[model samples]
Target: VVQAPTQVPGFLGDSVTLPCYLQVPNMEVTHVSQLTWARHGESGSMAVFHQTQGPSYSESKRLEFVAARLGAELRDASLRMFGLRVEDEGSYTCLFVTFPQGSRSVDIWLRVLAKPQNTAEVQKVQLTGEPVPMARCVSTGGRPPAQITWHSDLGGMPQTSQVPGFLSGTVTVTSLWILVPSSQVDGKQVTCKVEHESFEKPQLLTVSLTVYY
Candidate 1:
């Protein structure tokens, strides 16, 4: 008595559903005693929660989840989690203690995703043949860590970093565009392009270069 919807994906601050169910023969209403949701971990098995006394009685050892239709029917034991976090990404098990011989367990996975913020700033520089830090691009709090590049013919060498974000699951990418010195580049526009899974298209940030002559 089980099925799929096995893999669940949730946004970092959104809600998601992990589904599990029991099917019985014709006219057979199985006596569903209780159920439990446990997390599968390395080195140890952890309990997310346990339920008894006909759905009304349950304990959330970790996150607060709602079994939406736990009202009168044990047929649908889909777990819904709200405000997902970085640590919530993992594989979980749902075990149902049903009567008349067969108790079942199902496995599910939870994945978290987040968006990023992009920023670009112009750094002060003097007109010289030496390389100067023209502009810096930053993408913060991204799940995939946004890709940054220059969109100018200035032939700027962009130095990037695999910077970690505030959360373990997210990333903050930084790219500094070091421009080759020139007098004709003053007051010209330099663009920083950001590409990420969360964005509909590449984000462009234009900065006016000011070289003190």
Candidate 2:
């Protein structure tokens, strides 16, 4: 005669669905019952959806009720949101007020991740004999940050740095791969690979080394 809740993971700028249902053992929905969706906040919680009042969409264009038909049919208490972002990460509660029975509620956690945009550049440092080629790869504007790695025909570790965005909650990762002027890497390529949860495929930045030694 009772039920529990679940958690859901989402991505930035992607649509996500939060699910809920009334659990009444050996009982089916024969009449109209009350249902509500709430978003818990630091100050207080606010209603996102009400069974009778419909959806309370935000004017900031953050949350949209793309799928409000689920609860309208009295089958499920599921809601959908579009264009999700980092600020949208929070706890959501689904409450079903059933007739002849008590209210059943479930909590759903929403997690958001953002994809990264990457770029690479090559700089030559005038050293003693030949110039040292420094390849820098930068990944910008990504949530949860991006892991940057360097790969080359000549194997070595690259220097990496992570800078956090205070207002945006995003991160910028820079990786520097230094190469000594030598024939081994003169015609080879140095690659900067970026890995993130939002990436469909790993991002790569390749720089061709042309040492004039």
Candidate 3:
């Protein structure tokens, strides 16, 4: 029986493991003549392992070999990768070339995550009683976009928009907070909270809302 997961997750500049297994009482890692991990659309093999050549990588700087049990105890053909990039996100196929059964293959999907660089700024505005853009929060280079929410004791309305970033699946999100200018709003702390799984904790970007009395 063949075994592998359909999907796997990886973080930017991090590591991930893609597993492919075809182990049985009759068939073991000893039966595998060779094994390879290749990307679906990309040319060339990522990594390959052979009985004589041992293990090699076409992209050795980024690809690595993970072993459940090497040599006689080998059970699974898994690949580990490090320093993952945006281009690394895609479908990859693992091929187990065995002498007894020819070959067994499985496809695995890779998803990459990135944390955004969050910042905030505020501009002084004259008392207008009318809603105006007083502060802004920005999240840059976040994959799949970042969630931004405005928080302030001064109470204000927020508008958020996302723009495509240079990297694949990356976005720059900006949130504009509108408030009616008044003395009470001056020197108050307004914060923007950015939420993303890549972040260890919710990020807070804050600025002091200023008003020209």
Candidate 4:
């Protein structure tokens, strides 16, 4: 059997059902024994989901096997994750246990969504620590992640990149930058701008950095 779409997106606090299966070509299946689900790309170790004397077992406490019973045809295995968070987002593989028939593994990527917050709206972006003179802006907590833009006193858009997808869902997005250490950028006004569909003005936070040395 063929696997479903490899990538799926889900919001927080939602249960995700990832499907996997194998196609048995011209083969008669007799018995199906153990079934397992393992983290994809895991090295130096092996963990499995197997049928116990009566109950199901998995070394990983995070993974709880709910529906271990397979279909009559020995096809289709599903793994469900309760309350999926950003940290829980990753690739996972499902394996079917059999002989002569062998086993089939399916890979998938789970994506978690984080909606943006309104705290940063019209808020003064606080600047802290040593001001490297360069202007950097970062923002977190937006669905599909929000883009951050940096502007100088004269108004010029700089470069930008998402903060590791893992961190994009955070409440605070930080932009770190180094500009020419001078009085111009000191109180010159560096703006942290965010773009989102919900807000027309875009969540903007601005904080100026001070340099002594």
Candidate 5:
């Protein structure tokens, strides 16, 4: 039996292992050959590996040789990528052929995330008794999109929207918090937090609400 992960997520400047495995139900693979790995696409579809020579860096320099073997048989067709970059986000394929059993292949997709920049601003402040949108938070230019959330000393639900960059393929998310005019929020701090896969901690934006009497 053979298996591989369908997708993997990676961050910039980090390393990631694309997983693949070969298993023998009742017998062990004594000898194996014709193991191959490559990027699957119309262009740049060059072999990342060959059983004899290892990783083929002729196509890319970021690729490194990192596969598991068992007694000359390649049991794990995994590959490790170093210093993950935006260009590395794509699909990869691993193939292994046996003497009598046949050939097996697996496809893996790589997703990457970029850190987000956020801005929080108070849109309006009024003494009217009616509820109104008081603040807006915008997080821009992040891959895989960013999760935007709101926190405040005052309690309320927040509305959010997302706009994707057509040319950059990145996303911008905005969150709007609604509040009613009250003395409780006159000096309270409203915070906007952005979460993304690339961030080790949540990015925060804060603003103080000032409602005049």
Candidate 6:
């Protein structure tokens, strides 16, 4: 898994393909059998594409896998990303399913060109104070702009902030509240993330708040 130039540049609406050569010690990779493609986030992982086991195909919409089987000589696998938008700019890594050597990674950078007002953000946070615990999230510095989304690790609930101009900036901020927090808030994680519309990576800002007994 080696990148040619390391930094590959692309424009908006362009079709980008990251080529991957899967190297297996002895196994022969022939025609879309047991292959997978995925995209990973800071908190979660999703399979963007995959191939079926044996000869049959797997029923997944997002993932697409294609292979050229030259037996043990050369196993060609390519990742095709279509319709590159400003939101598609980030660090993408490709992993191959190798038998003896396990999986090796090939990392590449994706930069999408857009205006200064279209950056992307990823985060979770709390701004709790007195009676309740409040949460907050903020994202800054990207091309277009970035948005902050909140989630509770303790509970399966998703809530958002109502801060004005939350999503209206080349630089943005997002906040959440717990409405009167207690001593339990002393060392909690509050995240602030920023996504850019350009080719740069997403920036994350995290802080912890303290509560009085």
**Worst lDDT window (10 residues) for model 3?**
43-52
For every candidate in turn, the CA RMSD to the true structure comes to: 4.0, 4.2, 4.2, 7.9, 4.7, 14.5
Worst 10 residues of 5 by lDDT: 165-174
Q: Which stretches of candidate 2 lie above 4 Å from their native place? A: 1-9, 14-16, 22-27, 30-32, 53-72, 83-85, 129-132, 158-184
Which residue runs of candidate 4 sit more than 4 Å off their true CA positions? 23-30, 52-55, 59-63, 66-75, 85-90, 119-144, 148-172, 175-213
Model 6 TM-score, 2 decimals: 0.37
Tens digit of per-residue lDDT, candidate 2, span 1-213: 334355666766666766676554555553354565666654265545655456444453455443354446553556666655555646666666666465656656655565557677776543434324656666566665666666666644333444443323345443344544434355567777777776577777887765544
Among all windows of 10 consecutive residues in model 1, the one with the lowest summed lDDT is 53-62
Question: Residue-wise lDDT of candidate 5 within 1-213, one digit each (tens)?
Answer: 567655776655556667766666556553454566666654365545755444455556656756544345545666776656665545667777776465756766666555546666775655555454456666555555565666665646443444443324344443434453445456567766777676677877777776665
Model 2: lDDT equals 0.57
TM-score, model 2 to reference:
0.71
Cα lDDT computed for each candidate against the true fold: 0.61, 0.57, 0.59, 0.51, 0.59, 0.42
Residues 62-149, candidate 1: write the lDDT tens digits: 3454554444465556676764666564667777767765576776765557776767787676656555546666675666677667
lDDT, candidate 4, 97-191, per-residue tens = 56666655555556555555533222223344312354445445555456656564644323333344444445434433333333334355666
Better-scoring candidate (lDDT), 2 or 6? 2
- Model 4 residue 191 distance off true place after TM-score fit, in angstroms: 13
Which ranges of candidate 5 are over 4 A from the true structure?
68-75, 87-89, 117-133, 147-185, 189-207
User: In lDDT terms, which candidate is top?
Assistant: 1
Pairs that collide in candidate 2 are: none
How accurate locally is residue 145 in candidate 4, as Cα lDDT from 0 to 100?
A: 50
In candidate 3, position 29 carries an lDDT of 35
Off by over 4 Å in 3: 22-30, 43-52, 59-62, 68-71, 99-102, 129-133, 151-183, 188-191, 205-208
